[PDB]
Amino acid sequence: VGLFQTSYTLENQGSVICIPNNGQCFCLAWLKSNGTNAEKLAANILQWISFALSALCLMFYGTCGWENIYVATIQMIKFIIEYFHSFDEPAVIYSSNGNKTRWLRYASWLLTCPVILIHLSNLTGLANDYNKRTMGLLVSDIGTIVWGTTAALSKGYVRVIFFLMGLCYGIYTFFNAAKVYIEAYHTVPKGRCRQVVTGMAWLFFVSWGMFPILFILGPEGFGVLSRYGSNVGHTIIDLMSKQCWGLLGHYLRVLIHSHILIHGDIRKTTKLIEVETLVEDE
Amino acid sequence: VGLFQTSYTLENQGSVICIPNNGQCFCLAWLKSNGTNAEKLAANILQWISFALSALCLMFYGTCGWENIYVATIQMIKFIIEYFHSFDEPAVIYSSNGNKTRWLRYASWLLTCPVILIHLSNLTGLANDYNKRTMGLLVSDIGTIVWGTTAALSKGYVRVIFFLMGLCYGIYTFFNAAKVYIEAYHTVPKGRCRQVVTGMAWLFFVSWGMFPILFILGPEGFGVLSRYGSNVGHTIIDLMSKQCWGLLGHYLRVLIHSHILIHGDIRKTTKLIEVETLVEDE
Numbered sequence: 001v002g003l004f005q006t007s008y009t010l011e012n013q014g015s016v017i018c019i020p021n022n023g024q025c026f027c028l029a030w031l032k033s034n035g036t037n038a039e040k041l042a043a044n045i046l047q048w049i050s051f052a053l054s055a056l057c058l059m060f061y062g063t064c065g066w067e068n069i070y071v072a073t074i075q076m077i078k079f080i081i082e083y084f085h086s087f088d089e090p091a092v093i094y095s096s097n098g099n100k101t102r103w104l105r106y107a108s109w110l111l112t113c114p115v116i117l118i119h120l121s122n123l124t125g126l127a128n129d130y131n132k133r134t135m136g137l138l139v140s141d142i143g144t145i146v147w148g149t150t151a152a153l154s155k156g157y158v159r160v161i162f163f164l165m166g167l168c169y170g171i172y173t174f175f176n177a178a179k180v181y182i183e184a185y186h187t188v189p190k191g192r193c194r195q196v197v198t199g200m201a202w203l204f205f206v207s208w209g210m211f212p213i214l215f216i217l218g219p220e221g222f223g224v225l226s227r228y229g230s231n232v233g234h235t236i237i238d239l240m241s242k243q244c245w246g247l248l249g250h251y252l253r254v255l256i257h258s259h260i261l262i263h264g265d266i267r268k269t270t271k272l273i274e275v276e277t278l279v280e281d282e
Numbered sequence: 283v284g285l286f287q288t289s290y291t292l293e294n295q296g297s298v299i300c301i302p303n304n305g306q307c308f309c310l311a312w313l314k315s316n317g318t319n320a321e322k323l324a325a326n327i328l329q330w331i332s333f334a335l336s337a338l339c340l341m342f343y344g345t346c347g348w349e350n351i352y353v354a355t356i357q358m359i360k361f362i363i364e365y366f367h368s369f370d371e372p373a374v375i376y377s378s379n380g381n382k383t384r385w386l387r388y389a390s391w392l393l394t395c396p397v398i399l400i401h402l403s404n405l406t407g408l409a410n411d412y413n414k415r416t417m418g419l420l421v422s423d424i425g426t427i428v429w430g431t432t433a434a435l436s437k438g439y440v441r442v443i444f445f446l447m448g449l450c451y452g453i454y455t456f457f458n459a460a461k462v463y464i465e466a467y468h469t470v471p472k473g474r475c476r477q478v479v480t481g482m483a484w485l486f487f488v489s490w491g492m493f494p495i496l497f498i499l500g501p502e503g504f505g506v507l508s509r510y511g512s513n514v515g516h517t518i519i520d521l522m523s524k525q526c527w528g529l530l531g532h533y534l535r536v537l538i539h540s541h542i543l544i545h546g547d548i549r550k551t552t553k554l555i556e557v558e559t560l561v562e563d564e
C-alpha cells in the first residue's frame with residue numbers, strides 16, 4: 001500500500017529476506033504500524049477541524065496583519081497535502097536507518113514558526129518597528145527546528161546530541177520571547193489589551209513547550225505515543241499555537257487600532273528598559 | 283561500507299533480490315555511484331580550504347558583527363560533521379523512493395541563509411534598524427529552501443511543483459535583496475564603501491543564482507553532475523556566498539565605522555524612497 005517494497009518472503013529459517021527485483025526500496029522497520037485505527041480516525045478528525053478553522057480564519061481575516069494570512073494559508077495548504085499523502089514520500093521520510101521522519105510537520109514549522117515570532121515581535125502591529133532581538137528569536141528558532149529535524153532523522157546518540165542542540169536553541173527562543181511579552185504587556189493599554197496579551201503568552205509557551213514534549217513521547221523518542229498518536233497531539237498544539245494564537249493577536253491588534261483612533265497614540269515612559277505605555281488622556 | 287544493506291544476491295533469473303535478514307534497509311538505487319574518485323578528491327580538497335577559510339575567519343573576526351561569526355561557526359562545525367559523515371544518515375538521506383537528499387547542505391542553508399539576509403538588511407551595521415522588508419526577505423528565503431529541500435526529496439512532477447514553488451519564493455527573495463543593495467549603495471559614502479557594496483551584490487546574486495542552477499544540473503535534476511560533482515560546485519558558491527561575502531560585509535562595516543568616527547554621522551536626504559546618504563562635511 002506504499003511506494004516502497006511491502007511484499008517479501010522469508011527464507012533460510014528466517015535469516016534471508018527475498019524481495020522482488022522491481023526497483024522498489026525495502027526495509028522491515030518501515031512496515032511497523034503507525035498506530036491503532038482508533039487513533040488514525042482521531043487524527044483524521046482533527047485534520048478537518050484544523051482545516052475548517054484555517055478556512056474559517058482565511059474567510060474571517062478577509063495595519064495589514066499579513067502574518068496571520070501566511071500560517072493560515074500554509075496550514076490549509078498542508079492539509080490538502082496531508083489529505084492525499086499523509087504518509088507518502090517525502091511527506092514522511094522513510095530513511096536508510098529505518099527512521100520515519102514526518103518532514104511535512106517540520107517543514108510546516110520552518111514555514112510558520114518564524115512568521116509567528118515576527119507577529120510576536122510586532123505584537124501591537126504598529127509601524128515598521130521590530131528590534132535586533134527579533135533576529136535572535138528567528139535565528140534561534142530555525143535552529144531548534146533544524147536540530148529537532150536532524151534529531152528525528154538521526155538515531156541513538158547523535159539524535160540526543162542534535163536534540164540537546166535544539167533544546168539549547170529552544171531555551172534561547174523562549175527567554176527572548178518572554179522579554180517580548182513582558183514589554184508587550186506594559187506597552188499595550190491597561191484595558192482588555194493586557195488580558196489578551198497575557199493569554200497569548202500562555203497559548204504560546206504551553207503549545208510551544210509541548211513540541212519538545214511530544215518529541216520525547218513520540219517515535220522520535222521513547223515511543224510511548226504512536227505515529228498516529230503523535231499526529232493527534234501535534235494537531236492540538238498546532239491548533240493552539242497557530243490558529244488560536246493568531247486569532248488573539250488579531251483581536252489584540254484590533255483593540256490597539258481602536259484605542260489608537262479613539263484616544264490617539266499617547267506614550268507615558270515607564271521604567272522596567274523604558275517602555276512607551278499607551279494611555280488614554282494626555 | 284554503509285549503515286544500510288549493501289551485499290545481496292540475485293535469484294530467479296534476476297527477478298528476485300534476496301538480502302540478509304539483519305534488520306538493515308535495502309535499496310538498489312542507493313548503491314548508485316556518487317561520482318568519480320577524481321571528483322571526490324576535488325571535493326575533499328575544497329572541504330579543507332573552506333574549513334581553513336572558516337578557521338582563518340573565526341581567527342580574524344576575533345558594532346558587533348555577530349552575523350559573520352554565526353555562519354563561520356556553522357560552516358566549520360559542518361565540516362567537522364562532513365569530514366566524519368559526509369554520506370551517512372542523516373547527513374545524506376537515503377529515502378524510500380531511492381532519493382539521496384543531502385540534508386546536511388539544506389540544513390546549513392536554513393542555518394546561514396537568514397543570517398546573511400539579516401547582515402544584508404543591516405549592511406552598514408548601524409544601530410537597531412532593519413525594516414518590514416527584512417521579514418519578506420527571511421520568510422521568502424526559508425520558503426525557497428523548504429520547497430527546494432522538498433523538491434530534492436520528492437521525485438518527478440511534485441519535485442517540479444515544489445521546485446517551482448521554491449523558484450517563485452526565490453524570485454521574491456532576489457528582488458527584495460536588490461531593493462536593499464540599491465538603497466545601501468546610495469546610503470554608504472561616495473568612497474570605497476560603494477565599491478565594496480556593489481561587489482557584495484555581485485558575490486550575492488552570482489553565488490545565490492548558482493544554487494537553483496546546481497539543483498537543475500545535479501542528481502536533484504537532470505544529473506549532468508555527479509553527487510561528488512555537485513559537492514564540488516556547491517562548495518565554491520558556498521565559499522563565495524558565505525565566507526567571502528561576509529568578509530566584504532566586514533570590510534564594509536569597518537569603512538563605515540571609520541567614516542562615522544572621522545567625519546561623524548552626517549545625513550543628506552537624496553531622492554529615489556528617501557535615503558539618508560552619509561557625507562563628509564556639514
Ligand SMILES: *C/C=C(C)/C=C/C=C(C)/C=C/C1=C(C)CCCC1(C)C
Nearest residue numbers: 113144148166167170211212215241
Ligand atoms: C506551529 C508550530 C510551531 C510554532 C512549533 C514550534 C516548535 C518548536 C519550538 C520545537 C522545538 C523543539 C526543541 C526546542 C527541541 C528539539 C526538538 C523540538 C524541535 C520539537
Ligand SMILES: *C/C=C(C)/C=C/C=C(C)/C=C/C1=C(C)CCCC1(C)C
Nearest residue numbers: 395426430448449452493494497523
Ligand atoms: C550559504 C548558502 C546559501 C546562502 C544558499 C542559498 C540558496 C538558495 C537561495 C537556493 C534557492 C533554490 C531555489 C530558489 C529554487 C529551489 C531550489 C533552490 C533551493 C536550491
